[PDB]
């Protein structure tokens, strides 16, 4: 275990008092904390009362002399010696007062895990029984992972109480913070942690992490039905891959808001997917979705897709398809998606009204969005689109609007003109 070091590096004026600035170092991690003298005095009272500490160890409250800078410098030195004596006297388990004083509960492995076991003691059983989402940080998961790798005992201990909760939890959210955590040098995304301690997860939500550093999600592979990973991966296989067993329960997968640039071989591991969100990524083409026979809702919006040619050979019997925010000018290839019900093409580049011919004969379509495409500026746009749906013109919601009988009457005469 790393040695714990404290330095009183300086001081500054806050309101009408001086705070002493302490840099705390534990191995490679470093953080800063600020305390006025009376916070050290309040610390010292608890340490003498509860841990038998020498009552004269703290420098004096009364301070007198002619040079204020020199007095503050002597107090700075003396408070540094005080903290170093305390840290040498408690090399093992740190008193909770001293842990909170140096912010070990926020940045130090044993303080973090102590604070987590206090949280789970107070609230854990209630939220397990309520079926509520538990929120945790990569730094908490790191600290738990590190104690297990240090071989720290379970028998129960704080680490035992934590494991017994993680074993049972069904609903989990892991949220990383972008950049340095608090007053520390810690980058959460660089911290490795192991989810094997979770053994009954049904739903998981990961945001602002790095999936290179996440291990052990496969311990909940028999139970995991829903997975969201956002702002956290470069590929699907980086999340879905450690014979490899399939994600047998997984019906909802959200990998939106990432840098994913292809659909990869890890599709072989997600055969029962019903809902797939891949929006806000770097996709240029669709492929490898052929064998996801249960896929019903597909979101590919805000990628860099430019063609839909052959899409019926790449997809199963999809019902809802979102392609909004891509680079599409042509709808060629959609005309064989006979199962399709809901289609979103908003915010693309569609400009020829004649492209609607690729969707007008679709037998099940009930919803179409073309908002923010150039085609929407054409005169009589709505009635021109709906007329291409033939005798289904009454059955399609166009652009989130109720179709009027004035539209349908305008369509029936336009259709009689096209018939003649």
GROMACS .gro file of C-alpha atoms in nm:
model
  420
    1UNK     CA    1   0.000   0.000   0.000
    2UNK     CA    2   0.130   0.355  -0.085
    3UNK     CA    3   0.254   0.588   0.188
    4UNK     CA    4   0.032   0.890   0.264
    5UNK     CA    5   0.202   1.232   0.256
    6UNK     CA    6   0.081   1.582   0.346
    7UNK     CA    7   0.254   1.917   0.286
    8UNK     CA    8   0.124   2.259   0.395
    9UNK     CA    9   0.238   2.435   0.078
   10UNK     CA   10   0.098   2.781   0.149
   11UNK     CA   11  -0.182   2.998   0.281
   12UNK     CA   12  -0.441   3.246   0.153
   13UNK     CA   13  -0.696   3.496   0.283
   14UNK     CA   14  -1.064   3.390   0.284
   15UNK     CA   15  -1.312   3.653   0.411
   16UNK     CA   16  -1.148   3.769   0.742
   17UNK     CA   17  -0.926   3.461   0.809
   18UNK     CA   18  -0.629   3.261   0.676
   19UNK     CA   19  -0.663   2.909   0.538
   20UNK     CA   20  -0.364   2.677   0.516
   21UNK     CA   21  -0.335   2.497   0.183
   22UNK     CA   22  -0.248   2.129   0.221
   23UNK     CA   23  -0.129   1.916  -0.072
   24UNK     CA   24  -0.205   1.551   0.001
   25UNK     CA   25  -0.028   1.277  -0.196
   26UNK     CA   26  -0.105   0.904  -0.202
   27UNK     CA   27   0.116   0.727  -0.458
   28UNK     CA   28   0.046   0.876  -0.802
   29UNK     CA   29  -0.265   1.065  -0.682
   30UNK     CA   30  -0.237   1.422  -0.551
   31UNK     CA   31  -0.507   1.664  -0.427
   32UNK     CA   32  -0.541   1.995  -0.241
   33UNK     CA   33  -0.745   2.085   0.070
   34UNK     CA   34  -0.780   2.418   0.258
   35UNK     CA   35  -0.835   2.461   0.634
   36UNK     CA   36  -0.827   2.751   0.881
   37UNK     CA   37  -0.642   2.692   1.211
   38UNK     CA   38  -0.966   2.630   1.405
   39UNK     CA   39  -1.041   2.332   1.179
   40UNK     CA   40  -0.711   2.178   1.295
   41UNK     CA   41  -0.810   2.264   1.653
   42UNK     CA   42  -1.150   2.097   1.606
   43UNK     CA   43  -0.967   1.796   1.453
   44UNK     CA   44  -0.727   1.783   1.749
   45UNK     CA   45  -1.010   1.777   2.007
   46UNK     CA   46  -1.162   1.466   1.843
   47UNK     CA   47  -0.823   1.297   1.801
   48UNK     CA   48  -0.730   1.347   2.171
   49UNK     CA   49  -1.076   1.235   2.288
   50UNK     CA   50  -1.116   0.927   2.064
   51UNK     CA   51  -0.758   0.811   1.975
   52UNK     CA   52  -0.562   0.903   2.295
   53UNK     CA   53  -0.340   1.155   2.102
   54UNK     CA   54  -0.090   1.382   2.284
   55UNK     CA   55  -0.285   1.694   2.388
   56UNK     CA   56   0.020   1.923   2.335
   57UNK     CA   57   0.093   1.797   1.979
   58UNK     CA   58  -0.101   2.077   1.800
   59UNK     CA   59   0.067   2.424   1.773
   60UNK     CA   60  -0.087   2.696   1.991
   61UNK     CA   61  -0.409   2.887   1.926
   62UNK     CA   62  -0.263   3.212   2.070
   63UNK     CA   63  -0.014   3.370   1.824
   64UNK     CA   64   0.168   3.698   1.898
   65UNK     CA   65   0.453   3.901   1.747
   66UNK     CA   66   0.548   4.195   1.524
   67UNK     CA   67   0.575   4.033   1.175
   68UNK     CA   68   0.250   3.875   1.047
   69UNK     CA   69   0.422   3.698   0.752
   70UNK     CA   70   0.681   3.537   0.981
   71UNK     CA   71   0.414   3.423   1.229
   72UNK     CA   72   0.203   3.266   0.951
   73UNK     CA   73   0.516   3.093   0.814
   74UNK     CA   74   0.592   2.942   1.159
   75UNK     CA   75   0.230   2.828   1.193
   76UNK     CA   76   0.252   2.681   0.838
   77UNK     CA   77   0.563   2.478   0.936
   78UNK     CA   78   0.410   2.368   1.267
   79UNK     CA   79   0.080   2.250   1.111
   80UNK     CA   80   0.282   2.052   0.852
   81UNK     CA   81   0.476   1.879   1.132
   82UNK     CA   82   0.146   1.812   1.312
   83UNK     CA   83  -0.013   1.641   1.007
   84UNK     CA   84   0.304   1.440   0.934
   85UNK     CA   85   0.313   1.317   1.297
   86UNK     CA   86  -0.056   1.215   1.270
   87UNK     CA   87   0.006   1.030   0.940
   88UNK     CA   88   0.309   0.850   1.089
   89UNK     CA   89   0.104   0.752   1.399
   90UNK     CA   90  -0.188   0.617   1.188
   91UNK     CA   91  -0.007   0.428   0.905
   92UNK     CA   92  -0.287   0.166   0.895
   93UNK     CA   93  -0.658   0.248   0.919
   94UNK     CA   94  -0.707   0.627   0.933
   95UNK     CA   95  -0.943   0.784   1.194
   96UNK     CA   96  -1.260   0.901   1.024
   97UNK     CA   97  -1.203   1.261   1.142
   98UNK     CA   98  -0.853   1.272   0.985
   99UNK     CA   99  -0.981   1.098   0.672
  100UNK     CA  100  -1.254   1.363   0.622
  101UNK     CA  101  -1.006   1.643   0.710
  102UNK     CA  102  -0.762   1.535   0.434
  103UNK     CA  103  -1.053   1.436   0.197
  104UNK     CA  104  -0.958   1.065   0.191
  105UNK     CA  105  -1.333   0.990   0.157
  106UNK     CA  106  -1.322   1.158  -0.188
  107UNK     CA  107  -0.977   1.065  -0.326
  108UNK     CA  108  -0.813   0.782  -0.120
  109UNK     CA  109  -0.892   0.412  -0.177
  110UNK     CA  110  -0.974   0.315   0.184
  111UNK     CA  111  -1.161   0.640   0.257
  112UNK     CA  112  -1.369   0.604  -0.061
  113UNK     CA  113  -1.461   0.243   0.021
  114UNK     CA  114  -1.537   0.335   0.384
  115UNK     CA  115  -1.771   0.612   0.264
  116UNK     CA  116  -1.936   0.374   0.015
  117UNK     CA  117  -2.005   0.114   0.285
  118UNK     CA  118  -2.156   0.394   0.500
  119UNK     CA  119  -2.377   0.496   0.204
  120UNK     CA  120  -2.489   0.137   0.138
  121UNK     CA  121  -2.549   0.074   0.509
  122UNK     CA  122  -2.780   0.377   0.526
  123UNK     CA  123  -2.959   0.349   0.184
  124UNK     CA  124  -2.865   0.023   0.006
  125UNK     CA  125  -3.137  -0.219   0.113
  126UNK     CA  126  -3.409   0.043   0.050
  127UNK     CA  127  -3.299   0.111  -0.309
  128UNK     CA  128  -3.251  -0.266  -0.383
  129UNK     CA  129  -3.610  -0.327  -0.269
  130UNK     CA  130  -3.745  -0.016  -0.445
  131UNK     CA  131  -3.580  -0.128  -0.772
  132UNK     CA  132  -3.411   0.212  -0.811
  133UNK     CA  133  -3.099   0.284  -1.019
  134UNK     CA  134  -2.781   0.294  -0.812
  135UNK     CA  135  -2.531   0.560  -0.925
  136UNK     CA  136  -2.155   0.506  -0.880
  137UNK     CA  137  -1.833   0.665  -1.012
  138UNK     CA  138  -1.531   0.501  -1.184
  139UNK     CA  139  -1.322   0.620  -0.888
  140UNK     CA  140  -1.545   0.430  -0.642
  141UNK     CA  141  -1.535   0.119  -0.862
  142UNK     CA  142  -1.157   0.160  -0.892
  143UNK     CA  143  -1.116   0.179  -0.514
  144UNK     CA  144  -1.328  -0.138  -0.465
  145UNK     CA  145  -1.134  -0.316  -0.742
  146UNK     CA  146  -0.800  -0.212  -0.588
  147UNK     CA  147  -0.890  -0.337  -0.238
  148UNK     CA  148  -0.991  -0.676  -0.385
  149UNK     CA  149  -0.660  -0.697  -0.576
  150UNK     CA  150  -0.480  -0.605  -0.249
  151UNK     CA  151  -0.657  -0.913  -0.105
  152UNK     CA  152  -0.825  -0.714   0.174
  153UNK     CA  153  -1.062  -0.936   0.379
  154UNK     CA  154  -1.437  -0.956   0.339
  155UNK     CA  155  -1.510  -1.085   0.696
  156UNK     CA  156  -1.844  -0.814   0.785
  157UNK     CA  157  -1.600  -0.546   0.659
  158UNK     CA  158  -1.685  -0.236   0.451
  159UNK     CA  159  -1.567  -0.434   0.147
  160UNK     CA  160  -1.791  -0.725   0.254
  161UNK     CA  161  -2.097  -0.497   0.283
  162UNK     CA  162  -2.019  -0.349  -0.062
  163UNK     CA  163  -1.985  -0.691  -0.230
  164UNK     CA  164  -2.308  -0.820  -0.073
  165UNK     CA  165  -2.493  -0.520  -0.224
  166UNK     CA  166  -2.322  -0.541  -0.567
  167UNK     CA  167  -2.408  -0.912  -0.588
  168UNK     CA  168  -2.782  -0.827  -0.567
  169UNK     CA  169  -2.810  -0.499  -0.763
  170UNK     CA  170  -3.023  -0.514  -1.081
  171UNK     CA  171  -3.004  -0.146  -1.200
  172UNK     CA  172  -2.670   0.042  -1.232
  173UNK     CA  173  -2.551   0.380  -1.364
  174UNK     CA  174  -2.178   0.457  -1.398
  175UNK     CA  175  -2.113   0.828  -1.458
  176UNK     CA  176  -1.759   0.960  -1.511
  177UNK     CA  177  -1.666   1.328  -1.474
  178UNK     CA  178  -1.483   1.487  -1.767
  179UNK     CA  179  -1.130   1.605  -1.674
  180UNK     CA  180  -0.960   1.626  -1.329
  181UNK     CA  181  -1.183   1.506  -1.047
  182UNK     CA  182  -1.245   1.774  -0.780
  183UNK     CA  183  -0.924   1.923  -0.639
  184UNK     CA  184  -0.723   1.616  -0.748
  185UNK     CA  185  -0.496   1.518  -1.038
  186UNK     CA  186  -0.718   1.207  -1.092
  187UNK     CA  187  -0.850   1.142  -1.444
  188UNK     CA  188  -1.143   0.902  -1.388
  189UNK     CA  189  -1.136   0.771  -1.748
  190UNK     CA  190  -0.783   0.630  -1.690
  191UNK     CA  191  -0.890   0.418  -1.388
  192UNK     CA  192  -0.941   0.041  -1.447
  193UNK     CA  193  -1.228  -0.131  -1.266
  194UNK     CA  194  -1.395  -0.472  -1.256
  195UNK     CA  195  -1.774  -0.524  -1.276
  196UNK     CA  196  -1.745  -0.901  -1.200
  197UNK     CA  197  -1.860  -0.813  -0.844
  198UNK     CA  198  -2.202  -0.744  -0.998
  199UNK     CA  199  -2.374  -1.076  -1.065
  200UNK     CA  200  -2.743  -0.991  -1.129
  201UNK     CA  201  -2.743  -0.675  -1.345
  202UNK     CA  202  -3.048  -0.637  -1.569
  203UNK     CA  203  -2.992  -0.276  -1.682
  204UNK     CA  204  -2.663  -0.084  -1.711
  205UNK     CA  205  -2.598   0.280  -1.804
  206UNK     CA  206  -2.236   0.397  -1.864
  207UNK     CA  207  -2.156   0.761  -1.950
  208UNK     CA  208  -1.826   0.953  -1.988
  209UNK     CA  209  -1.597   0.653  -1.912
  210UNK     CA  210  -1.341   0.461  -2.126
  211UNK     CA  211  -1.452   0.109  -2.222
  212UNK     CA  212  -1.085   0.000  -2.261
  213UNK     CA  213  -1.063   0.017  -1.880
  214UNK     CA  214  -1.393  -0.162  -1.800
  215UNK     CA  215  -1.378  -0.537  -1.722
  216UNK     CA  216  -1.623  -0.801  -1.595
  217UNK     CA  217  -1.961  -0.689  -1.737
  218UNK     CA  218  -1.989  -1.049  -1.867
  219UNK     CA  219  -2.054  -1.175  -1.509
  220UNK     CA  220  -2.411  -1.038  -1.564
  221UNK     CA  221  -2.434  -1.175  -1.921
  222UNK     CA  222  -2.720  -1.421  -1.830
  223UNK     CA  223  -2.932  -1.136  -1.685
  224UNK     CA  224  -2.841  -0.814  -1.873
  225UNK     CA  225  -3.139  -0.701  -2.087
  226UNK     CA  226  -3.053  -0.331  -2.133
  227UNK     CA  227  -2.717  -0.160  -2.191
  228UNK     CA  228  -2.642   0.207  -2.262
  229UNK     CA  229  -2.281   0.318  -2.320
  230UNK     CA  230  -2.241   0.684  -2.424
  231UNK     CA  231  -1.934   0.910  -2.461
  232UNK     CA  232  -1.719   0.608  -2.369
  233UNK     CA  233  -1.617   0.379  -2.662
  234UNK     CA  234  -1.445   0.366  -3.003
  235UNK     CA  235  -1.609   0.039  -3.122
  236UNK     CA  236  -1.888  -0.208  -3.047
  237UNK     CA  237  -1.641  -0.489  -2.973
  238UNK     CA  238  -1.464  -0.268  -2.716
  239UNK     CA  239  -1.789  -0.291  -2.510
  240UNK     CA  240  -1.932  -0.629  -2.612
  241UNK     CA  241  -1.612  -0.845  -2.627
  242UNK     CA  242  -1.381  -0.936  -2.329
  243UNK     CA  243  -1.582  -1.965  -2.783
  244UNK     CA  244  -1.738  -1.643  -2.649
  245UNK     CA  245  -2.097  -1.670  -2.504
  246UNK     CA  246  -2.367  -1.448  -2.646
  247UNK     CA  247  -2.552  -1.175  -2.453
  248UNK     CA  248  -2.855  -1.409  -2.432
  249UNK     CA  249  -3.086  -1.164  -2.248
  250UNK     CA  250  -2.982  -0.840  -2.424
  251UNK     CA  251  -3.278  -0.685  -2.605
  252UNK     CA  252  -3.190  -0.312  -2.582
  253UNK     CA  253  -2.848  -0.171  -2.674
  254UNK     CA  254  -2.765   0.200  -2.687
  255UNK     CA  255  -2.419   0.292  -2.816
  256UNK     CA  256  -2.514   0.646  -2.920
  257UNK     CA  257  -2.283   0.947  -2.880
  258UNK     CA  258  -1.954   0.763  -2.940
  259UNK     CA  259  -1.686   0.747  -3.215
  260UNK     CA  260  -1.804   0.414  -3.364
  261UNK     CA  261  -1.705   0.402  -3.733
  262UNK     CA  262  -1.828   0.054  -3.835
  263UNK     CA  263  -2.072  -0.215  -3.724
  264UNK     CA  264  -1.835  -0.499  -3.631
  265UNK     CA  265  -1.809  -0.875  -3.564
  266UNK     CA  266  -1.957  -0.831  -3.211
  267UNK     CA  267  -2.307  -0.844  -3.369
  268UNK     CA  268  -2.257  -1.223  -3.345
  269UNK     CA  269  -2.282  -1.185  -2.966
  270UNK     CA  270  -2.611  -0.983  -2.957
  271UNK     CA  271  -2.857  -1.202  -3.158
  272UNK     CA  272  -3.173  -1.124  -2.951
  273UNK     CA  273  -3.151  -0.740  -2.986
  274UNK     CA  274  -3.485  -0.564  -3.045
  275UNK     CA  275  -3.372  -0.201  -3.002
  276UNK     CA  276  -3.039  -0.075  -3.135
  277UNK     CA  277  -2.929   0.289  -3.103
  278UNK     CA  278  -2.610   0.380  -3.290
  279UNK     CA  279  -2.697   0.749  -3.343
  280UNK     CA  280  -2.437   1.026  -3.310
  281UNK     CA  281  -2.142   0.815  -3.435
  282UNK     CA  282  -1.907   0.803  -3.741
  283UNK     CA  283  -2.090   0.537  -3.948
  284UNK     CA  284  -2.058   0.565  -4.329
  285UNK     CA  285  -2.239   0.243  -4.428
  286UNK     CA  286  -2.475  -0.013  -4.275
  287UNK     CA  287  -2.368  -0.380  -4.267
  288UNK     CA  288  -2.354  -0.691  -4.039
  289UNK     CA  289  -2.719  -0.639  -3.918
  290UNK     CA  290  -2.840  -0.932  -4.140
  291UNK     CA  291  -2.864  -1.193  -3.861
  292UNK     CA  292  -3.030  -0.977  -3.590
  293UNK     CA  293  -3.368  -1.135  -3.673
  294UNK     CA  294  -3.547  -0.973  -3.376
  295UNK     CA  295  -3.431  -0.612  -3.450
  296UNK     CA  296  -3.737  -0.388  -3.460
  297UNK     CA  297  -3.620  -0.034  -3.370
  298UNK     CA  298  -3.300   0.091  -3.537
  299UNK     CA  299  -3.155   0.440  -3.484
  300UNK     CA  300  -2.871   0.546  -3.715
  301UNK     CA  301  -2.946   0.919  -3.696
  302UNK     CA  302  -2.663   1.175  -3.701
  303UNK     CA  303  -2.406   0.951  -3.868
  304UNK     CA  304  -2.245   1.013  -4.212
  305UNK     CA  305  -2.467   0.780  -4.422
  306UNK     CA  306  -2.499   0.880  -4.790
  307UNK     CA  307  -2.674   0.583  -4.957
  308UNK     CA  308  -2.949   0.333  -4.869
  309UNK     CA  309  -2.876   0.100  -5.165
  310UNK     CA  310  -2.912  -0.266  -5.072
  311UNK     CA  311  -3.034  -0.178  -4.719
  312UNK     CA  312  -3.304  -0.449  -4.743
  313UNK     CA  313  -3.023  -0.710  -4.777
  314UNK     CA  314  -2.852  -0.572  -4.462
  315UNK     CA  315  -3.164  -0.548  -4.236
  316UNK     CA  316  -3.429  -0.782  -4.096
  317UNK     CA  317  -3.799  -0.698  -4.049
  318UNK     CA  318  -3.748  -0.348  -3.898
  319UNK     CA  319  -4.059  -0.152  -3.789
  320UNK     CA  320  -3.902   0.183  -3.685
  321UNK     CA  321  -3.604   0.333  -3.870
  322UNK     CA  322  -3.439   0.665  -3.783
  323UNK     CA  323  -3.199   0.807  -4.043
  324UNK     CA  324  -3.239   1.175  -3.948
  325UNK     CA  325  -2.932   1.399  -3.960
  326UNK     CA  326  -2.732   1.193  -4.214
  327UNK     CA  327  -2.612   1.305  -4.563
  328UNK     CA  328  -2.891   1.136  -4.766
  329UNK     CA  329  -3.009   1.282  -5.101
  330UNK     CA  330  -3.170   0.962  -5.237
  331UNK     CA  331  -3.417   0.710  -5.094
  332UNK     CA  332  -3.326   0.428  -5.338
  333UNK     CA  333  -3.311   0.094  -5.155
  334UNK     CA  334  -3.593   0.163  -4.903
  335UNK     CA  335  -3.866   0.031  -5.136
  336UNK     CA  336  -3.811  -0.334  -5.025
  337UNK     CA  337  -3.838  -0.264  -4.645
  338UNK     CA  338  -4.199  -0.393  -4.653
  339UNK     CA  339  -4.221  -0.434  -4.271
  340UNK     CA  340  -4.141  -0.064  -4.211
  341UNK     CA  341  -4.396   0.143  -4.016
  342UNK     CA  342  -4.213   0.453  -3.887
  343UNK     CA  343  -3.949   0.638  -4.094
  344UNK     CA  344  -3.754   0.946  -3.987
  345UNK     CA  345  -3.550   1.118  -4.259
  346UNK     CA  346  -3.553   1.472  -4.109
  347UNK     CA  347  -3.251   1.704  -4.134
  348UNK     CA  348  -3.099   1.521  -4.441
  349UNK     CA  349  -3.031   1.660  -4.796
  350UNK     CA  350  -3.343   1.529  -4.978
  351UNK     CA  351  -3.438   1.767  -5.260
  352UNK     CA  352  -3.611   1.575  -5.546
  353UNK     CA  353  -3.981   1.512  -5.463
  354UNK     CA  354  -3.954   1.212  -5.698
  355UNK     CA  355  -3.751   1.025  -5.430
  356UNK     CA  356  -4.076   0.965  -5.236
  357UNK     CA  357  -4.153   0.700  -5.503
  358UNK     CA  358  -3.919   0.468  -5.305
  359UNK     CA  359  -4.146   0.483  -4.997
  360UNK     CA  360  -4.495   0.561  -5.139
  361UNK     CA  361  -4.567   0.193  -5.212
  362UNK     CA  362  -4.462   0.073  -4.861
  363UNK     CA  363  -4.761  -0.130  -4.727
  364UNK     CA  364  -4.725  -0.065  -4.351
  365UNK     CA  365  -4.585   0.291  -4.327
  366UNK     CA  366  -4.779   0.504  -4.079
  367UNK     CA  367  -4.523   0.777  -4.008
  368UNK     CA  368  -4.287   0.982  -4.224
  369UNK     CA  369  -4.068   1.277  -4.130
  370UNK     CA  370  -3.893   1.489  -4.393
  371UNK     CA  371  -3.873   1.815  -4.188
  372UNK     CA  372  -3.563   2.034  -4.249
  373UNK     CA  373  -3.499   1.872  -4.594
  374UNK     CA  374  -3.501   2.107  -4.902
  375UNK     CA  375  -3.797   1.915  -5.052
  376UNK     CA  376  -4.016   2.076  -4.781
  377UNK     CA  377  -3.980   2.416  -4.957
  378UNK     CA  378  -4.150   2.295  -5.281
  379UNK     CA  379  -4.503   2.438  -5.351
  380UNK     CA  380  -4.784   2.206  -5.239
  381UNK     CA  381  -4.520   1.983  -5.068
  382UNK     CA  382  -4.754   1.794  -4.828
  383UNK     CA  383  -5.018   1.707  -5.089
  384UNK     CA  384  -4.746   1.610  -5.339
  385UNK     CA  385  -4.587   1.370  -5.085
  386UNK     CA  386  -4.919   1.219  -4.975
  387UNK     CA  387  -5.041   1.161  -5.336
  388UNK     CA  388  -4.741   0.926  -5.387
  389UNK     CA  389  -4.889   0.703  -5.110
  390UNK     CA  390  -5.186   0.624  -5.338
  391UNK     CA  391  -5.479   0.476  -5.146
  392UNK     CA  392  -5.273   0.486  -4.821
  393UNK     CA  393  -5.254   0.870  -4.824
  394UNK     CA  394  -5.509   0.876  -4.535
  395UNK     CA  395  -5.290   0.642  -4.323
  396UNK     CA  396  -4.953   0.829  -4.301
  397UNK     CA  397  -4.867   1.092  -4.041
  398UNK     CA  398  -4.645   1.336  -4.233
  399UNK     CA  399  -4.407   1.564  -4.038
  400UNK     CA  400  -4.586   1.517  -3.698
  401UNK     CA  401  -4.907   1.685  -3.835
  402UNK     CA  402  -5.271   1.570  -3.861
  403UNK     CA  403  -5.364   1.540  -4.228
  404UNK     CA  404  -5.668   1.753  -4.312
  405UNK     CA  405  -5.960   1.658  -4.535
  406UNK     CA  406  -5.861   1.963  -4.746
  407UNK     CA  407  -5.527   1.782  -4.805
  408UNK     CA  408  -5.697   1.449  -4.885
  409UNK     CA  409  -5.948   1.617  -5.120
  410UNK     CA  410  -5.658   1.798  -5.291
  411UNK     CA  411  -5.487   1.457  -5.315
  412UNK     CA  412  -5.790   1.275  -5.463
  413UNK     CA  413  -5.818   1.532  -5.747
  414UNK     CA  414  -5.438   1.522  -5.803
  415UNK     CA  415  -5.472   1.139  -5.819
  416UNK     CA  416  -5.765   1.163  -6.065
  417UNK     CA  417  -5.547   1.392  -6.283
  418UNK     CA  418  -5.255   1.142  -6.266
  419UNK     CA  419  -5.502   0.856  -6.352
  420UNK     CA  420  -5.638   1.027  -6.667
   0.00000   0.00000   0.00000
